[PDB]
Design an enzyme around this catalytic site. Structure first.
Site, PDB file in Angstrom:
ATOM      1  N   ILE A   1      53.007  49.933 -62.745  1.00 43.29           N
ATOM      2  CA  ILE A   1      53.773  50.184 -63.962  1.00 43.29           C
ATOM      3  C   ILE A   1      53.962  51.661 -64.268  1.00 43.29           C
ATOM      4  O   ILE A   1      54.792  52.017 -65.103  1.00 43.29           O
ATOM      5  CB  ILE A   1      53.256  49.392 -65.183  1.00 43.29           C
ATOM      6  CG1 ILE A   1      51.809  49.809 -65.574  1.00 43.29           C
ATOM      7  CG2 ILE A   1      53.392  47.882 -64.931  1.00 43.29           C
ATOM      8  CD1 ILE A   1      51.220  49.100 -66.760  1.00 43.29           C
ATOM      9  N   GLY A   2      53.181  52.511 -63.631  1.00 41.63           N
ATOM     10  CA  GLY A   2      53.350  53.922 -63.901  1.00 41.63           C
ATOM     11  C   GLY A   2      52.559  54.880 -63.062  1.00 41.63           C
ATOM     12  O   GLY A   2      51.888  54.503 -62.094  1.00 41.63           O
TER      13      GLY A   2
ATOM     14  N   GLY B   1      50.186  58.414 -64.018  1.00 43.31           N
ATOM     15  CA  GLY B   1      49.552  59.277 -65.007  1.00 43.31           C
ATOM     16  C   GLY B   1      49.420  60.678 -64.436  1.00 43.31           C
ATOM     17  O   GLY B   1      49.988  60.982 -63.375  1.00 43.31           O
ATOM     18  N   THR B   2      48.650  61.537 -65.108  1.00 45.16           N
ATOM     19  CA  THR B   2      48.423  62.904 -64.625  1.00 45.16           C
ATOM     20  C   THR B   2      47.504  62.952 -63.407  1.00 45.16           C
ATOM     21  O   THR B   2      47.489  63.974 -62.720  1.00 45.16           O
ATOM     22  CB  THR B   2      47.939  63.841 -65.744  1.00 45.16           C
ATOM     23  OG1 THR B   2      46.946  63.189 -66.526  1.00 45.16           O
ATOM     24  CG2 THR B   2      49.059  64.282 -66.629  1.00 45.16           C
TER      25      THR B   2
ATOM     26  N   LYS C   1      43.975  52.012 -64.586  1.00 45.38           N
ATOM     27  CA  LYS C   1      44.142  53.308 -63.934  1.00 45.38           C
ATOM     28  C   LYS C   1      42.968  53.439 -62.959  1.00 45.38           C
ATOM     29  O   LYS C   1      41.815  53.309 -63.372  1.00 45.38           O
ATOM     30  CB  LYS C   1      44.103  54.417 -64.986  1.00 45.38           C
ATOM     31  CG  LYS C   1      45.229  55.410 -64.916  1.00 45.38           C
ATOM     32  CD  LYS C   1      44.957  56.584 -65.858  1.00 45.38           C
ATOM     33  CE  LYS C   1      46.033  56.776 -66.893  1.00 45.38           C
ATOM     34  NZ  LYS C   1      45.882  58.078 -67.625  1.00 45.38           N
TER      35      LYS C   1
ATOM     36  N   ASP D   1      51.096  66.664 -73.124  1.00 52.41           N
ATOM     37  CA  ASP D   1      51.946  65.963 -72.123  1.00 52.41           C
ATOM     38  C   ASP D   1      52.848  64.906 -72.779  1.00 52.41           C
ATOM     39  O   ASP D   1      53.044  63.813 -72.241  1.00 52.41           O
ATOM     40  CB  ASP D   1      51.043  65.320 -71.024  1.00 52.41           C
ATOM     41  CG  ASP D   1      51.747  64.990 -69.709  1.00 52.41           C
ATOM     42  OD1 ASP D   1      52.821  65.578 -69.443  1.00 52.41           O
ATOM     43  OD2 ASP D   1      51.239  64.124 -68.967  1.00 52.41           O
TER      44      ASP D   1
HETATM   45  N1  LIG Z   1      56.783  51.795 -67.005  1.00 53.54           N
HETATM   46  S1  LIG Z   1      56.545  50.420 -67.871  1.00 53.54           S
HETATM   47  O1  LIG Z   1      56.399  49.356 -66.943  1.00 53.54           O
HETATM   48  O2  LIG Z   1      57.503  50.297 -68.905  1.00 53.54           O
HETATM   49  C1  LIG Z   1      54.951  50.499 -68.579  1.00 53.54           C
HETATM   50  C2  LIG Z   1      54.036  51.456 -68.473  1.00 53.54           C
HETATM   51  C3  LIG Z   1      52.858  51.133 -69.158  1.00 53.54           C
HETATM   52  C4  LIG Z   1      51.692  52.027 -69.222  1.00 53.54           C
HETATM   53  N2  LIG Z   1      50.535  51.743 -69.740  1.00 53.54           N
HETATM   54  C5  LIG Z   1      49.595  52.724 -69.723  1.00 53.54           C
HETATM   55  C6  LIG Z   1      48.275  52.684 -70.256  1.00 53.54           C
HETATM   56  C7  LIG Z   1      47.463  53.791 -70.156  1.00 53.54           C
HETATM   57  C8  LIG Z   1      47.920  54.966 -69.530  1.00 53.54           C
HETATM   58  C9  LIG Z   1      49.217  55.035 -69.010  1.00 53.54           C
HETATM   59  C10 LIG Z   1      50.043  53.903 -69.100  1.00 53.54           C
HETATM   60  S2  LIG Z   1      51.708  53.641 -68.557  1.00 53.54           S
HETATM   61  C11 LIG Z   1      52.894  49.948 -69.791  1.00 53.54           C
HETATM   62  S3  LIG Z   1      54.404  49.175 -69.552  1.00 53.54           S
END
Ligand SMILES: NS(=O)(=O)c1cc(-c2nc3ccccc3s2)cs1
EC number: 2.7.11.1
Length: 276
Positions: free
Chosen positions: A11-12, A14-15, A34, A115
């Protein structure tokens, strides 16, 4: 331990690594995971002390190091993609209110995020916003280690001019950029190509700061004299859907001189949030 979680999808970023949507195998609770450093250790240290409804919750730490967070269905970038055009002005207001509440909470506890950008703002299905990714955050403005800074588009003029130290003013500039983005259906305010182009886009809109507005500007490590662009008459051209009180708040967030930027506490008291 670590195998207690089934990884569902990436989903992503981070740093300091990758974020996964995951399911607890014993309870089926959905979490953001993470897996992995100074950035991870700092995030645990801060999030164990920063509990607020507008700050992502850190549920657990598994020792490989796994950080188990609250799951939100979207980040603000994904939210913007799905909106595909103008956000309802009430949603714009609600999301800014929540971002300033989260920032206000951090700043009152001497924490700057450093950030702030749409990918680091989480939006759950109930319209609640949460700040995430505290891996670059500073406590009392003390540098923890590093060239690592917020992505170009959300960088303030002092940082673009090479300032290594700053107050919570850094987050208020990024909040102003995100406010313009909210009011503009996800369109970035200053989408610069590099540092020089970033400073040019900022000064062409707000005007190049004078010696009177910012006496110390000339002393910055990477200062460069720019053409003296005039201050654009109104922000009505860049944020057409944002009312006059909204534009006034936006102007107070976007002061080039860091000392002149409105605080999160003062922004929450702004007439923009009168009927809220
Ligand atoms: N990129 S996305 O699928 O819309 C999406 C990203 C996230 C994230 N959840 C977290 C929780 C903690 C730290 C960074 C992230 S990024 C939840 S949904």
């Amino acid at each position: 331990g670590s195998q207690k979680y089934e990884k569902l999808e990436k989903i992503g970023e981070g740093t300091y690594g990758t974020v996964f949507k995951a399911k607890n195998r014993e309870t089926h609770e959905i979490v953001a995971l993470k897996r992995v450093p100074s950035s991870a250790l700092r995030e645990i240290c801060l999030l164990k002390e920063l509990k607020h409804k507008n700050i992502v919750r850190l549920h657990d730490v598994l020792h490989k190091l796994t950080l188990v967070f609250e799951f939100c269905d979207q980040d603000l970038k994904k939210y913007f993609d799905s909106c595909n055009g103008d956000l309802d002005p009430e949603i714009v207001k609600s999301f800014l209110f929540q971002l300033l509440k989260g920032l206000g909470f951090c700043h009152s506890r001497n924490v700057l995020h450093r950030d702030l950008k749409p990918q680091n703002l989480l939006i759950n299905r109930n319209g609640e916003l949460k700040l995430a990714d505290f891996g670059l955050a500073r406590a009392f403005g003390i540098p923890v280690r590093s060239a690592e800074v917020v992505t170009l588009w959300y960088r303030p003029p002092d940082v673009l001019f090479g300032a290594k130290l700053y107050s919570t003013s850094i987050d208020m500039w990024s909040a102003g950029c995100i406010f313009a983005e909210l009011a503009n259906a996800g369109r970035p305010l200053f989408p610069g190509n590099d540092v020089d182009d970033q400073l040019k886009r900022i000064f062409r809109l707000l005007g190049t700061p004078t010696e009177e507005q910012w006496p110390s500007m000339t002393k910055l490590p990477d200062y460069k004299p720019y053409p003296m662009y005039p201050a654009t008459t109104s922000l009505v051209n860049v944020v057409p859907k944002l009312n006059a009180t909204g534009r006034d708040l936006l102007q107070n967030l976007l002061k080039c001189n860091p000392v002149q930027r409105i605080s999160a506490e003062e922004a929450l008291q702004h007439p923009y949030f009168s009927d809220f």
